[PDB]
Design a protein around this ligand. Structure first.
Ligand code: FAD
Ligand code: FAD
Ligand code: GP7
Ligand code: GP7
Lengths: 425, 425
C-alpha cells in the first residue's frame, strides 16, 4: 500500500507521480492503456513509413508555457519551430489579403473596435477564481451569438470564427463565448496570442519528454484500468478491471474528464459536480494529418470551409507533404475520403490527397474526447470545483486547469497544485 | 442696433450669423481682417503661380463631420479624395514595413495591448461633460510620460508619437495625454480614425464654402477689429479699433481663443476662465507646403524626423510636386531653408526643395495660434466653461468644441449651440 496512487499516465499523472516520488513518497502509477503520454501521442505515420507524427497535442510556446519550458530544459529535450507559413491560400472573400493576418485596411476600424470589446470582456475573467464564481453568465452563450453582436465585416468575422473553430474544436453554435474569452485570458489577455502559441514542437516527438519523465517513476502498471475509487475506509481502495485492488492514503485522478463517469466513486462525488461529469464537456476537436501531392511548402489556409484551417505540417519529399486540418467530429467524418478531398480542394484545388491519419479521441474509451471545451452553460455553473479535491481524492489534468485548459501546460500546472496539496496535508 | 453681433468670420461666426439671420434676427458680422474664413484659408501658392492651396485647415471626413457634410451638400460644394499614399518612405527603423500601417508582426502583440489600454482610457471621456468635470486629472500629463508607460516597441512607439506630433501640433513633452485621448474619443473612440479623417478636401478650396455661407449674411464689416465688449448696460456695447461702436442684445465671440485676452470684457469674464485665457492654449502646429523636384507621386513619410510626417499634397508638373510637412513652431523654424532641406532629405534624400509656403498663425495678431491644443494641466482645470456664455456674451469656435476641437466640424457644432441658446432666450 502506497502514499499515493496516481490514475492516468498523461503529462499530469506523470508529473504528479514523479514529483511525489522525489519528495520521498511511495507512489504507484496506474495507466489503463499500453502507452504513456495520453493525449500527447507521437507515433509512426500511417501514411509515410518511418515518419514520426503527433496525433494528439504537441504545439507549445515557451513564453506561455513556463512549466513545459522547464521540463524541456530539465531533460535537454530539443524543440523546433513549427512549420513556417509563407504561402497564403485563404477562403475569406475577395477583399482578404493573402498574408497571415489577412485583414484589409477597409476593415481596420471594425477590428480596432472589436479588439477593445473582446479584450474588455476577457479582462472580466480572473483566472484564479473559476468561471462559475465571477458573475460571467451573460457571456456563457453560443459563440455565434456573441460574434453577431460584434458586427464584424466579412474577413475579420470569418477569420475569428475559423480560428475559434480550430481552437475550441466546436462549431460556432456550440462553442461558448465565455470559453473563447477564457482562452484569450489564458494567453495573457491576447487574441493574437491564442494562435501565436503555435510556436514550437518536439524535435523527436512528445514521447521524448514522456519517456524522460517516466524514467523517474519507479512503479508503473500499464493496461490497468481503474473502475472504482472508494474512500469510505481509513485508506483509499482502488479497484481495477481485471486485477487485484490497490490501496493508498491519497488518490490523484489524472484521467480525462469525460472518463470520470466510468469510475465508481465511494462515496459519490459532491453533488454540484455530478451533472457535468455525467454529461461530459463538449470538446469535439478533430486534427487530421493529410498526406498530399502537389502542395508547395509553407501553405496556410484559413476560411469558411468545413476545414476552418488547413496548413503545412511537414515535408515528406520533393513532391509530397503532410498538411494538417482542424475541424470537429460533429461536423466532419474523416472516414469519408471524398469529403476530405472536397474540403482540401476548396482551398487547394491543385492538390491531390494521398491519404489521411488521425486518432478518434472521442471513440477511445480511455478518453471519450479530445481537448476540453464546455458546452454552453456548463462552466458558469461549475468549473473550479471540478478540479478541487473530494476528501483524499484529487482531480488534475488539462481538462480542469483554470490557467491553461486544453493545453499540456494545464496538465503540468494542475499536477503542481495537487502535489503541493498532498505534501502539506 | 442689432439682435446679435457676431465677432469673427470664420466658419463658426459665419454659421452663427447666417443661421440667426435666417431665423429672422437682425445680425451684424464684424471681421477684423480683409477676408472671411479665418483658419480656413485657401489662396494662391507662393511657389506655383495659378495653383490654389490650403494654408490653414482643410481636410474633412463626411462621416466624422456631419455638420460640414451638410453644408457641402447644402451648397453643392464639390470635394475630392485627399492625395493617395502609394509609396512609403518611413523613418521608423529597419523592422518597419513600408506601408501605411508600418507595424511588423513582431510588434503585433504589443500593439494589441496598447490598443486596449488607449481605448479603455479614451472611454473614460464623456464628450458632453467637459474635461475638467470627470476626474481625468491623472491622464493630464505629458504625452511622453503616458507613452512611456505603454512600453511600446520601436516602430509602434514612434509611429504613434509621430502622428501625435502632427495632430496635436506639440512635441511629446508638451502635449497632454488627456488631449490625445480626447481626439481619440472625438473620432468615435478610434485611434485609427484620428488619421483616417484625412479623407477629403475642397475641390475648389475652402473659400468655396466660405463664400456660399457669406452670401447669406446681409451685413458684414471687414477690417473691423473688436477691442471691447461691455455688457454692463441693458444692451451690449461693442467697441472697435478705429470705429464707432456697435450695440446688440447678444454678442457671439467667434474669435480664436488665444485672442480673447486682447479684448476688454466688462464686466470681467468669470474668474475660473481668466488664467487659461491669459496664458492661451499651447497649440503650435505648423503646416508647411514644400515645393519639390524629383519626388514620385503618392509618397508618405512617417518617422522620427523633425518633420514627424511628410507626405504628398499635389501634382504640379511631371517633375514637380508639393509635399506637406507637419511639425511645430516651437521646434522648427521654417525661415531656415537649410533646416527644411535637411528635414526633407532625412526621409527623401533624392528630392530637391524648390521652395516653401506657410502661414505663421502664431504671429498673426488675428489668431495667435494654429488649432487648439492645451498645455498640460489646463483642460482638466477648465474646459467646458470656456465655451459657456457669460451673460449675453457667447463663446464659440473650434477651440472650444467639446465634440470636435481643432476641426472645422467643431466650429460648426459650437455655432449651432449658441444659435439655439439665443433663439430660446
Ligand atoms: C487532437 C489534439 C490536439 C491537441 N493540441 C495541443 C497542442 O497543440 N498543444 C497543447 O499544449 N495541447 C494540445 N492538446 C491538449 C493536450 O494534449 C491535453 O490536454 C493533455 O495532453 C492532457 O494531459 P492530461 O495529463 O490532462 O490527460 P491525458 O494525456 O488524457 O492522460 C489521461 C491518462 O488517463 C488514462 N486513463 C483513462 N481512463 C483510465 C482509467 N479508468 N484507468 C487508468 N488510466 C486511465 C489515459 O489512457 C491517459 O494515458 C491536444 C489534444 C488533442 C487530443
Ligand atoms: C495649420 C492648420 C491646419 C488645420 N487643419 C485642419 C484640418 O485638416 N481639418 C479641420 O477640420 N480643421 C483644420 N484646422 C483647424 C480649423 O481650421 C480651425 O479650428 C477652424 O477653421 C476655426 O474656425 P473658427 O470659426 O473657430 O475660428 P477662425 O477661423 O479662427 O475664425 C476666427 C475669426 O476671428 C477673426 N478675428 C480675430 N480677432 C478679432 C477681433 N478682435 N475682432 C474681429 N475679428 C477678429 C479672425 O480674423 C477670424 O476670421 C487647421 C487649422 C490650422 C491653423
Ligand atoms: C492622436 C494620435 C493618433 C495616433 C494615430 C496612430 C495610428 C494611426 C494609424 C493610421 C494609419 C492607418 C492605415 C490603415 C491601414 C491600411 O490602410 O493598410 C492596411 C493595414 O491595416 C490592417 O492590416 C488592419 C490593422 C488592424 C489594426 C487594428 C488595431 C488598431 C491599431 C491601433 C494603432 C496604434 C498604433 C500604436 C499603438 C494594410 O494594407 P491595405 O490597407 O492595402 O490592406
Ligand atoms: C479563440 C479564438 C482566437 C481567434 C484568433 C484570431 C486572431 C488571430 C490572428 C493570428 C495571426 C496573427 C499573425 C501575426 C501578424 C503577422 O505576423 O503578419 C503581420 C501582421 O501584423 C500586423 O501588421 C500588426 C497587426 C496589429 C493587430 C493588433 C490588433 C489585434 C487584432 C485582433 C485580431 C482580431 C481578429 C478579429 C477581431 C504582417 O506581416 P509580417 O508579419 O510579415 O510583418
Amino acid at each position: 500500500m502506497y502514499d499515493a496512487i496516481v490514475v492516468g499516465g498523461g503529462f499530469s499523472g506523470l508529473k504528479a507521480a514523479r514529483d511525489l516520488t522525489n519528495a520521498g513518497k511511495k507512489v504507484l502509477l496506474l495507466e489503463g492503456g499500453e502507452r504513456l503520454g495520453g493525449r500527447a501521442y507521437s507515433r509512426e505515420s500511417r501514411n509515410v513509413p518511418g515518419l514520426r507524427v503527433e496525433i494528439g497535442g504537441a504545439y507549445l510556446h515557451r513564453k506561455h508555457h513556463p512549466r513545459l519550458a522547464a521540463e524541456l530544459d530539465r531533460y535537454g529535450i530539443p524543440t523546433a519551430a513549427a512549420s513556417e507559413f509563407t504561402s497564403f491560400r485563404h477562403r475569406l472573400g475577395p477583399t482578404a489579403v493573402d498574408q497571415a493576418f489577412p485583414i484589409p485596411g477597409s476593415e481596420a476600424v471594425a477590428v480596432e473596435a472589436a479588439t477593445y470589446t473582446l479584450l474588455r470582456d476577457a479582462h472580466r475573467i480572473d483566472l484564479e477564481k473559476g468561471l462559475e464564481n465571477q458573475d460571467l453568465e451573460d457571456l456563457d452563450i453560443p459563440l455565434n451569438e456573441y460574434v453577431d453582436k460584434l458586427d464584424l465585416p466579412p474577413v475579420s468575422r470569418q477569420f475569428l470564427l475559423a480560428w475559434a473553430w480550430n481552437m475550441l474544436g466546436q462549431p460556432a453554435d456550440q462553442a461558448s463565448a465565455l470559453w473563447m474569452l477564457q482562452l484569450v485570458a489564458a494567453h495573457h489577455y491576447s487574441i493574437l496570442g491564442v494562435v501565436l502559441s503555435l510556436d514550437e514542437v518536439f524535435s523527436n516527438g512528445s514521447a521524448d519528454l514522456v519517456d524522460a519523465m517516466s524514467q523517474e517513476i519507479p512503479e508503473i502498471r500499464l493496461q490497468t484500468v481503474v473502475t472504482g475509487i472508494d474512500q469510505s475506509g481509513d485508506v483509499v481502495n482502488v479497484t481495477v478491471k481485471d486485477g487485484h485492488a490497490f490501496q493508498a492514503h491519497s488518490v490523484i485522478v489524472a484521467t480525462p474528464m469525460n472518463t470520470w463517469r466510468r469510475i465508481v466513486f465511494t462515496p459519490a462525488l459532491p453533488e454540484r459536480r455530478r451533472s457535468v461529469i455525467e454529461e461530459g464537456h463538449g470538446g469535439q476537436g478533430l486534427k487530421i494529418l493529410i498526406h498530399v501531392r502537389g502542395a508547395e511548402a509553407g501553405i496556410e489556409c484559413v476560411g469558411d470551409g468545413i476545414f476552418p484551417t488547413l496548413y503545412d505540417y511537414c515535408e515528406v519529399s520533393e513532391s509530397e507533404r503532410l498538411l494538417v486540418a482542424f475541424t470537429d467530429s460533429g461536423s466532419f467524418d474523416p472516414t469519408d475520403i471524398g469529403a476530405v478531398k472536397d474540403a482540401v480542394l476548396y482551398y487547394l484545388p491543385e492538390v491531390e490527397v494521398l491519404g489521411i491519419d488521425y486518432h478518434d479521441w472521442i471513440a477511445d474509451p480511455l478518453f471519450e474526447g479530445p481537448w476540453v471545451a464546455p458546452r454552453v452553460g456548463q462552466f458558469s455553473r461549475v468549473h473550479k470545483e471540478l478540479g478541487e479535491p473530494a476528501g483524499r481524492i484529487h482531480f488534475v489534468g488539462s481538462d480542469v486547469s483554470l490557467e491553461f485548459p486544453g493545453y499540456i501546460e494545464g496538465a503540468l500546472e494542475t499536477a503542481e497544485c495537487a502535489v503541493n496539496a498532498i505534501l502539506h496535508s
